[PDB]
Amino acid sequence: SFTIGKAIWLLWGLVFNNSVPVQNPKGTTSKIMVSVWAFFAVIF
Amino acid sequence: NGMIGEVVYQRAVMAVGSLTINEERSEVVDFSVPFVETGISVMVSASVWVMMFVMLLIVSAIAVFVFEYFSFTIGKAIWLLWGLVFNNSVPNPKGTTSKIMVSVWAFFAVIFLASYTANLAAFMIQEEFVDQVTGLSDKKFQRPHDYSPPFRFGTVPNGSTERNIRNNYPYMHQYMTRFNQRGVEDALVSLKTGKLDAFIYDAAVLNYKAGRDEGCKLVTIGSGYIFATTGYGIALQKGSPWKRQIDLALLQFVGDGEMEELETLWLTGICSSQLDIDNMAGVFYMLAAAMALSLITFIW
Amino acid sequence: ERNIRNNYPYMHQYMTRFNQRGVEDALVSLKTGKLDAFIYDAAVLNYKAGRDEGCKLVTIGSGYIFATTGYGIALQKGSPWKRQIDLALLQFVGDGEM
Amino acid sequence: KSTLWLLVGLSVHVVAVMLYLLDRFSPTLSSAMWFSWGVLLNSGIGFSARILGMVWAGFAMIIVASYTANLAAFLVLDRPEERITGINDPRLRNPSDKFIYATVKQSSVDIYFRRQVELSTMYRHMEKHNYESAAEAIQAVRDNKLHAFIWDSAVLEFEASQKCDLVTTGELFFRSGFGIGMRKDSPWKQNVSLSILKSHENGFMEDLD
Amino acid sequence: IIVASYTANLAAFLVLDRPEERITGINDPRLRNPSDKFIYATVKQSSVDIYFRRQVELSTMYRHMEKHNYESAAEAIQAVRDNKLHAFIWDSAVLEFEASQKCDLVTTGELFFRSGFGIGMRKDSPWKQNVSLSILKSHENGFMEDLDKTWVRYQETLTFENMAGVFMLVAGGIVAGIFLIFIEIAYK
Amino acid sequence: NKKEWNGMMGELLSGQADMIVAPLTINNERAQYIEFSKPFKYQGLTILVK
Amino acid sequence: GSPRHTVPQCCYGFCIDLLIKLARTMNFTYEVHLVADGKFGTQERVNNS
Numbered sequence: 029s030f031t032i033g034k035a036i037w038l039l040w041g042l043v044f045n046n047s048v049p050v051q052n053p054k055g056t057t058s059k060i061m062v063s064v065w066a067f068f069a070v071i072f
Numbered sequence: 073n074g075m076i077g078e079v080v081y082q083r084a085v086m087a088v089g090s091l092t093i094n095e096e097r098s099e100v101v102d103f104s105v106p107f108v109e110t111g112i113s114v115m116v117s118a119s120v121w122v123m124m125f126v127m128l129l130i131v132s133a134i135a136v137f138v139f140e141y142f143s144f145t146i147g148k149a150i151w152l153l154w155g156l157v158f159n160n161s162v163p164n165p166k167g168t169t170s171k172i173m174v175s176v177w178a179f180f181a182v183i184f185l186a187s188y189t190a191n192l193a194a195f196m197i198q199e200e201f202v203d204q205v206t207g208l209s210d211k212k213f214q215r216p217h218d219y220s221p222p223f224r225f226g227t228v229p230n231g232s233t234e235r236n237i238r239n240n241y242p243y244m245h246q247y248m249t250r251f252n253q254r255g256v257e258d259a260l261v262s263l264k265t266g267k268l269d270a271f272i273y274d275a276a277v278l279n280y281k282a283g284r285d286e287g288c289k290l291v292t293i294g295s296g297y298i299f300a301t302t303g304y305g306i307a308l309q310k311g312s313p314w315k316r317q318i319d320l321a322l323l324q325f326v327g328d329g330e331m332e333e334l335e336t337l338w339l340t341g342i343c344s345s346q347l348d349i350d351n352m353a354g355v356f357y358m359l360a361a362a363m364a365l366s367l368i369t370f371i372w
Numbered sequence: 373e374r375n376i377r378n379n380y381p382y383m384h385q386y387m388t389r390f391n392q393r394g395v396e397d398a399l400v401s402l403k404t405g406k407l408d409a410f411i412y413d414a415a416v417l418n419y420k421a422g423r424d425e426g427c428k429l430v431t432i433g434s435g436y437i438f439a440t441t442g443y444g445i446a447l448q449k450g451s452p453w454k455r456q457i458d459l460a461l462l463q464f465v466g467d468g469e470m
Numbered sequence: 471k472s473t474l475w476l477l478v479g480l481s482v483h484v485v486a487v488m489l490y491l492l493d494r495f496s497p498t499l500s501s502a503m504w505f506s507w508g509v510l511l512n513s514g515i516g517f518s519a520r521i522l523g524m525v526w527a528g529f530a531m532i533i534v535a536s537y538t539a540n541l542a543a544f545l546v547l548d549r550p551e552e553r554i555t556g557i558n559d560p561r562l563r564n565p566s567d568k569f570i571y572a573t574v575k576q577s578s579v580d581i582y583f584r585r586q587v588e589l590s591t592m593y594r595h596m597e598k599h600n601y602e603s604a605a606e607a608i609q610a611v612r613d614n615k616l617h618a619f620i621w622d623s624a625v626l627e628f629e630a631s632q633k634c635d636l637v638t639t640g641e642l643f644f645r646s647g648f649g650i651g652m653r654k655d656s657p658w659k660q661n662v663s664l665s666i667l668k669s670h671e672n673g674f675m676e677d678l679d
Numbered sequence: 680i681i682v683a684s685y686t687a688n689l690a691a692f693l694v695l696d697r698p699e700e701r702i703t704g705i706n707d708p709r710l711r712n713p714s715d716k717f718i719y720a721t722v723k724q725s726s727v728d729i730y731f732r733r734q735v736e737l738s739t740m741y742r743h744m745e746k747h748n749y750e751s752a753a754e755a756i757q758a759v760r761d762n763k764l765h766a767f768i769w770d771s772a773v774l775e776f777e778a779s780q781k782c783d784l785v786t787t788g789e790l791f792f793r794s795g796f797g798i799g800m801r802k803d804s805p806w807k808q809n810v811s812l813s814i815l816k817s818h819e820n821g822f823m824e825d826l827d828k829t830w831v832r833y834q835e836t837l838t839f840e841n842m843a844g845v846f847m848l849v850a851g852g853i854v855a856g857i858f859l860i861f862i863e864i865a866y867k
Numbered sequence: 868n869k870k871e872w873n874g875m876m877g878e879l880l881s882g883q884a885d886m887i888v889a890p891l892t893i894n895n896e897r898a899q900y901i902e903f904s905k906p907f908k909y910q911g912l913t914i915l916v917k
Numbered sequence: 918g919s920p921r922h923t924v925p926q927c928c929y930g931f932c933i934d935l936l937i938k939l940a941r942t943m944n945f946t947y948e949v950h951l952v953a954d955g956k957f958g959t960q961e962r963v964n965n966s
């Protein structure tokens with residue numbers, strides 16, 4: 029309801045292993061893409 | 073025969089070329105002082121977790137104490153606590169002392185995993201020199217049927233090393249009788265091409281070929297620890313007046329390091345891959361322990 | 373000093389305030405802090421920095437923006453030893469004994 | 471000048487299957503399934519199966535720590551070993567045709583190595599590939615038809631400034647000098663060296679630099 | 680980027696920075712021209728003194744050690760054990776045996792002047808031929824290695840680096856947290 | 868200015884000793900003076916530190 | 918493999934300007950040519966003499 033266009037917010041707010049509450053995602057494709065970007069952030 | 077037959081029958085005065093020194097050669101003729109150390113060799117191919125467990129119980133007990141001060145994370149603080157150790161996005165603390173204590177615990181976990189990365193970097197520092205066989209006293213050196221591959225060994229033909237075998241173990245000479253060879257570089261090829269498993273020779277040529285091997289895939293055993301431990305010299309005829317002068321000249325050649333200089337001139341001091349299968353084996357053992365704990369909990 | 377007088381006369385007059393006595397004197401003056409730099413021959417200071425206690429005093433580069441000269445053997449104008457000494461030094465270069 | 475990760479992927483799919491089976495055995499479906507989808511990378515997830523989850527999360531962090539470890543071992547321990555490190559390279563002391571290196575045909579380095587009989591073998595390796603001009607060696611080494619060349623340091627560093635695909639090594643030897651080629655006793659013998667010394671004392675050599 | 684810098688400077692602070700606690704041989708330029716900080720010596724009136732008196736190029740070490748060369752070897756070992764000295768020149772297997780005794784004794788990497796021990800003898804005398812032949816007779820069998828088994832061959836992470844002070848600080852923070860529990864009691 | 872020996876060599880050449888059975892170092896000067904056996908021990912120089 | 922036919926060309930660089938400094942310095946002029954074959958020259962038996 030609030031992370032509609034705010035994907036940049038949850039995205040860049042979880043690059044850095046932050047432990048900061050953002051939103052619980054319901055989109056499974058969004059969850060897989062978040063897992064891909066977070067794996068790349070770990071190796072980054 | 074050979075150089076000994078030339079020296080004893082006096083068609084040659086001495087032999088400057090390299091030769092092993094043993095008993096009956098010293099019985100028939102004389103030898104100088106040694107100049108190189110040449111034996112033989114065989115060319116082949118928790119408490120921290122306990123004290124952090126105790127402090128984890130301390131943190132969980134003080135979290136229960138803050139709950140007793142002031143809605144279901146009483147004993148569930150251990151699971152969420154040990155998950156925030158690993159930062160897993162565990163599916164919220166409310167007490168201020170609990171938040172500060174769990175934060176100090178989490179910072180302690182972060183610096184402990186940073187020290188674990190330091191442990192990993194120190195593990196990256198460590199370069200190993202693995203040794204399969206560590207001496208002539210190996211139990212491989214009794215029977216190739218005692219172990220599951222029947223290996224092959226051998227020496228140079230008609231050598232003095234064969235005489236040392238025959239005066240040490242004639243049964244080893246009988247095993248070498250089925251395992252003979254002809255050429256030194258042919259023995260090198262047979263080691264490289266799998267036709268030969270091990271080779272027994274003095275440390276001189278083996279260390280010399282260790283300084284020129286393409287890849288250094290063949291390493292001997294140690295540096296002459298539990299081995300024959302003899303030297304090379306110059307054979308002279310009995311009654312030679314040159315003997316004392318040659319000995320003093322060799323001692324002067326040692327005493328300035330010019331012998332060492334010629335050793336350095338005629339030797340060569342030479343001689344990515346992820347590997348975690350020991351720690352992966354620990355991973356498999358601990359997941360077997362985890363399914364064993366599940367088998368314990370399967371009583372209900 | 374004469375080469376500086378040919379090259380930098382005003383800076384020679386600044387260095388007139390900055391004179392000293394000895395090689396170890398300038399060494400101690402650089403170790404303490406009463407001196408900021410020093411100008412001398414190349415390989416002498418290279419050897420003295422190669423034996424420096426802890427490699428404290430450092431040169432500038434490896435001799436690139438400098439006078440580009442060397443050391444030799446002085447003989448009088450007319451000595452017949454000149455060609456022999458020259459050929460012998462060339463022989464000592466040619467075998468790598470230098 | 472990966473597969474073990476696939477084994478870990480098979481293992482974590484086995485972990486997910488046994489998480490679903492033991493969560494069924496814990497007296498929900500898509501909850502435990504997508505939970506197993508979200509555990510293994512510490513993804514955002516907003517009690518007997520939780521034991522397997524917590525122990526396997528410990529496994530997953532020690533796995534990614536080992537990944538940090540072997541990437542650090544992959545990039546720190548792999549220093550560039552393509553450096554020949556001067557004349558003392560044992561691959562050149564006993565050379566082969568694997569390292570093709572030579573010098574200029576009819577050059578001073580040929581006589582310099584011909585006098586040094588202790589460097590005969592490299593000489594005998596380099597006598598069969600000598601080149602007429604140095605630019606032949608330049609074009610050959612730029613197109614990888616060579617592997618090394620023996621030359622003065624200043625010209626090679628100058629050409630490395632000209633061509634950034636060139637590498638100079640660490641060692642230095644035969645500290646010699648270039649001067650002006652001269653005849654015998656001549657009235658234009660002394661004053662030429664005097665003028666060169668006049669160029670060395672002032673900043674004219676600095677201007678040439 | 681703070682915790683990345685933390686990981687970087689801890690790897691710089693306790694992993695790669697291994698100090699030169701040893702000398703790594705005689706080719707140390709700090710020992711080619713030493714000072715009072717590096718007091719190395721050997722046995723006074725010994726064969727090492729003769730071998731270094733022969734060395735015309737290392738007379739600096741000869742002049743340096745001769746102010747500090749000691750009478751017996753074991754007293755010099757005890758003196759450098761009390762750190763009165765800094766290094767000791769000796770043959771190999773003796774120091775290897777002493778390191779096998781106590782693990783505070785460290786050898787070096789450079790192994791030079793591979794000399795030999797034999798039997799001291801007279802001039803021309805009939806107790807030399809068969810005796811040396813018997814020595815060579817005992818070389819071929821393992822009686823040499825039997826005597827090595829008597830004396831020569833027979834020898835005799837943990838994370839307490841910077842987390843000990845952190846352990847003490849968290850243990851004091853437990854007491855401070857109990858004090859903050861008393862503060863929360865004072866809140867009511 | 869008359870050079871002599873001492874120690875084990877001194878007790879040897881005086882007749883007080885007849886054979887040195889010891890870890891005795893083999894060198895050039897003693898071989899100019901006395902005789903040696905064939906060596907039993909082979910070892911090099913090293914540096915003991917703490 | 919071809920006849921020689923040495924032609925005048927433009928030449929410049931480092932030692933060129935050094936020689937120009939020499940001719941400007943000392944009272945002489947010069948005449949620039951080049952070697953017929955670009956070799957340093959080693960001492961060797963030619964097939965006769």
Ligand SMILES: *[C@@H]1O[C@H](CO)[C@@H](O[C@@H]2O[C@H](CO)[C@@H](O)[C@H](O)[C@H]2NC(C)=O)[C@H](O)[C@H]1NC(C)=O
Pocket residue numbers: 229230
């Ligand atoms: C090892 O000793 C044997 C002794 O039998 C020798 O064998 C000789 O080998 C050559 C090889 O061509 C033959 O021509 C001779 O007839 C053999 N002689 C004898 C007496 O057998 C030889 O000294 C050594 N063997 C090899 C092949 O090196």
Ligand SMILES: *[C@@H]1O[C@H](CO)[C@@H](O[C@@H]2O[C@H](CO)[C@@H](O)[C@H](O)[C@H]2NC(C)=O)[C@H](O)[C@H]1NC(C)=O
Pocket residue numbers: 657658659660661
């Ligand atoms: C070399 O250079 C000098 C430049 O001075 C030439 O001229 C001589 O210079 C000196 C003083 O430096 C005078 O005393 C002479 O009288 C000059 N020579 C003549 C011929 O007048 C000199 O000629 C040049 N030649 C050499 C090699 O001496």
Ligand SMILES: *[C@@H]1O[C@H](CO)[C@@H](O[C@@H]2O[C@H](CO)[C@@H](O)[C@H](O)[C@H]2NC(C)=O)[C@H](O)[C@H]1NC(C)=O
Pocket residue numbers: 919920921922924
């Ligand atoms: C060298 O100059 C000449 C012109 O003067 C040209 O080359 C000539 O071409 C013919 C072709 O067979 C050959 O005889 C020789 O190569 C040259 N002969 C003469 C007349 O010199 C050409 O302009 C120049 N060559 C190069 C390579 O630049």
Ligand SMILES: *[C@@H]1O[C@H](CO)[C@@H](O)[C@H](O)[C@H]1NC(C)=O
Pocket residue numbers: 805806809
């Ligand atoms: C040395 O050994 C031989 C062996 O026959 C013997 O005859 C001789 O007497 C011995 N000499 C001694 C006793 O030194």
Ligand SMILES: *[C@@H]1O[C@H](CO)[C@@H](O)[C@H](O)[C@H]1NC(C)=O
Pocket residue numbers: 944
């Ligand atoms: C060169 O020498 C001549 C005399 O031979 C003189 O007349 C002329 O001025 C000199 N030129 C220069 C460049 O000094």
Ligand SMILES: *[C@@H]1O[C@H](CO)[C@@H](O)[C@H](O)[C@H]1NC(C)=O
Pocket residue numbers: 963964
């Ligand atoms: C000319 O000399 C070379 C080098 O000695 C030789 O190889 C060649 O055969 C000679 N030419 C003829 C025509 O023989």
